[PDB]
Each structure stands twice: as structure tokens, then as C-alpha cells.
């Protein structure tokens, strides 16, 4: 089998992407944030604290004939941005872009932090990291991809995120019309449960390529590109007036600047992030100070190849026995 679903930016900055997901019988369609940096499928639901729901579409398991309570199971997660959620668990039928899994753990939120409540466009998260990170207790549950794996024509999914535009998540096949040149594959470490890999270096604008190993995770659920402070400093040094602002929470730059591209290495291959991708707009409405899309990972504890980077590529998440990541230009 295969699946194919369009993923759509939630706003004009590409702060996140939502993908429609059918849950239950009859289908209840929720717009979820596909997150290769976590491993819980959780949803706003009929069980969510009423004051914590503002505009989201909810999953109501009692209206689903295929929903079953996973008795005794609870979950609780916190993300890298400090947001969190928790609740209990149903199993139900879940379909993404024509691809159907029966008995998927659907984690029903009883509580969500303000950040989720305040975002009306996101109805939940669909984790696509490794199931070892799943937070369901006492019985850890498998991700949608893990459950679908052995039915898939090939045990892969691909992320093709758009710049200020929709893109595509594919399951079970590689669309050879969706990228240019070749896909370069690179080794993955699963020791921390992430799609963790080592970039071979970087360049700033038209500058020379610096060969250096940068360990990091391919994370569709993170907006920006978080890299070591040395790299990030070398980038913003090429933007007149740019500086790191403690008060704002990272690098800002004059909105009148033109941003240079940023290149990252995948083995001997190169992925170029256009400078436009690195502009996240005024720090506040009407401000002439703009927020940068490349930021320091210092104090996160891990480098993160978020959407800023991933959207410049066609990315293969190869879940074979020995997993790998592939990157192609597009």
C-alpha cells in the first residue's frame, strides 16, 4: 500500500504545516502537525478541558464505532519549546492520504498548554520519530508509520515541504518526479529515538564550504534551523546590522536587509536554503526588526534541522531495518 497527503502551512510565515487525517468510523477529519521529532499521535478531543479548546476540531471517540478505550493507558509529553499535553488513549482506525491503519493509538488530550489552545489551526500532532519515544504508559504504543510499515510497498515516507506553499507527505513510495538530480542518503542514529544524522558542513552565501561534522535531527515539527553558535554567528555576520537580542530571544536583523543563502552538506551533496526562507518577518507588527530563521542550538542540547532546512529539500525517511535519510534538491 501507499498514502499521499498534502501538507499546508498554517500561516504566511510557514510556522508549521497541517495535514488532514481521518480518524474513526465514520471518519472524523482532523488537521494534524506531522512531527518527525516526536512519536505520539494526539488530538484535541471531547475530553479536553473546555477552557483549553479554542477553535480546534475535536475527536469524539463516542461517535466512532471503531474506537475502543485502551484501558488504563495514559500519556504525557513536553516538547522542546516547553509546550505540553496529556490524557488517555483510544485505539481507532486512522487514515492518511488513502493509507489506513487499524488499531492505531489515538491519544486523547485531557489537558493542553496555552500554546496549543492559542493555535486554532492545529488539532493535534502525528509523531513520526521512532516508537521508543512514545510516551504511552504502561504499554508503549507504535507510531502511525511503524504500524503501517510492513503493509507499505516500501518502508519509507517522504517530506516535501513547500516555501509559502503547500507540500506533500508520501508513505510507501518515492516520487521520482518530485525532486531534481539524485537523492543522497546518509546514515541515521536511532540511539536517542530521533532521525539523527551528521551533516558534512556548511557555506554562507557564495562563500567557501566549511567541512565540519554537525550532528542534528531532521525535525518537521520544528519551524527554524538551530545550529551551533559558531555557525550561526558566521551566518549573521554577513547581514549588516544583524545581532543576537536577549530580549527578543535570538538573532534579529533589519527588515531592509537582503539575506544570503545558507548551504548544508549531505555527504558530498549540497542543499541550498535561499535567503528568503530565512526571513520570519517583523518581531512585532510594524517593527523594522525582523526575526531570523537560523538560530543557535546552544541550550537546546541538540542541533535541529527544522522546516527552514527541510523545505529546501525532498527528504526521504527510510525506515528499513537500518534506517537512513535521503536529501535531494528540488
In 24-133, beta strands by DSSP E: 28-35, 41-43, 68-78, 84-96, 99-112, 124-127
Q: Where do runs of H (alpha helix) occur along 153-228?
A: none
Concerning whether 38 is annotated as a catalytic residue, the answer is no
- Among candidate residues 33, 35, 88, 146, the one labeled active-site is 35
- Among candidate residues 38, 45, 95, 199, the one labeled active-site is 199
Strand-pair partners of 87: 75, 109
CA 199 to chain centre: 18
For residue 238, CA distances in Å to 16, 93, 243, 249 come to 27, 51, 11, 20
Concerning whether 199 is annotated as a catalytic residue, the answer is yes
User: Taking Cα atoms as reference points, which of 43, 62, 183 lies closest to residue 116?
Assistant: 43
Catalytic residues: 35, 199
Amino acid at each position: 500500500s501507499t498514502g499521499s497527503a498534502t501538507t499546508t502551512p498554517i500561516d504566511s510565515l510557514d510556522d508549521a504545516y497541517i495535514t488532514p487525517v481521518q480518524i474513526g468510523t465514520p471518519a472524523q477529519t482532523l488537521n494534524l502537525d506531522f512531527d518527525t521529532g516526536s512519536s505520539d499521535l494526539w488530538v484535541f478531543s471531547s475530553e479536553t478541558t473546555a477552557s483549553e479548546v479554542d477553535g480546534q476540531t475535536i475527536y469524539t471517540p463516542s461517535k466512532s464505532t471503531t474506537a475502543k478505550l485502551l484501558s488504563g493507558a495514559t500519556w504525557s509529553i513536553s516538547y522542546g519549546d516547553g509546550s505540553s499535553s496529556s490524557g488517555d488513549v483510544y485505539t481507532d482506525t486512522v487514515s492518511v492520504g488513502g493509507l489506513t491503519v487499524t488499531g492505531q493509538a489515538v491519544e486523547s488530550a485531557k489537558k493542553v498548554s496555552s500554546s496549543f489552545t492559542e493555535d486554532s489551526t492545529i488539532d493535534g500532532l502525528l509523531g513520526l520519530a521512532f516508537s521508543t519515544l512514545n510516551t504511552v504508559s504502561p504499554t508503549q504504543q507504535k507510531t502511525f508509520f511503524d504500524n503501517a510499515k510492513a503493509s507499505l510497498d516500501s518502508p519509507v515516507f517522504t517530506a516535501d515541504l513547500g516555501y509559502h506553499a503547500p507540500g506533500t507527505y508520501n508513505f510507501g513510495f518515492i516520487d521520482t518526479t518530485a525532486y531534481t538530480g539524485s537523492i543522497t542518503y546518509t546514515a541515521v542514529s536511532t540511539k536517542q529515538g530521533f532521525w539523527e544524522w551528521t551533516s558534512t558542513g556548511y557555506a554562507v552565501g557564495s562563500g567557501t564550504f566549511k567541512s565540519t561534522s554537525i550532528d542534528g535531527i531532521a525535525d518537521t515539527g520544528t519551524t527554524l534551523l538551530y545550529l551551533p553558535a559558531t555557525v550561526v554567528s558566521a551566518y549573521w555576520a554577513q547581514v549588516s546590522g544583524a545581532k543576537s537580542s536577549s530580549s527578543v530571544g535570538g538573532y534579529v536583523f533589519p527588515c531592509s536587509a537582503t539575506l544570503p543563502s545558507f548551504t548544508f552538506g549531505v555527504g558530498s551533496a549540497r542543499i541550498v536554503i535561499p535567503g528568503d526562507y530565512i526571513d520570519f518577518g517583523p518581531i512585532s507588527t510594524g517593527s523594522s526588526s525582523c526575526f531570523g530563521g537560523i538560530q543557535s542550538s546552544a541550550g537546546i542540547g541538540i542541533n535541529i534541522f527544522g522546516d527552514v532546512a527541510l523545505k529546501a529539500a525532498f527528504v526521504v525517511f527510510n525506515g528499513a531495518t537500518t534506517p537512513t535519510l535521503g536529501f535531494a534538491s528540488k
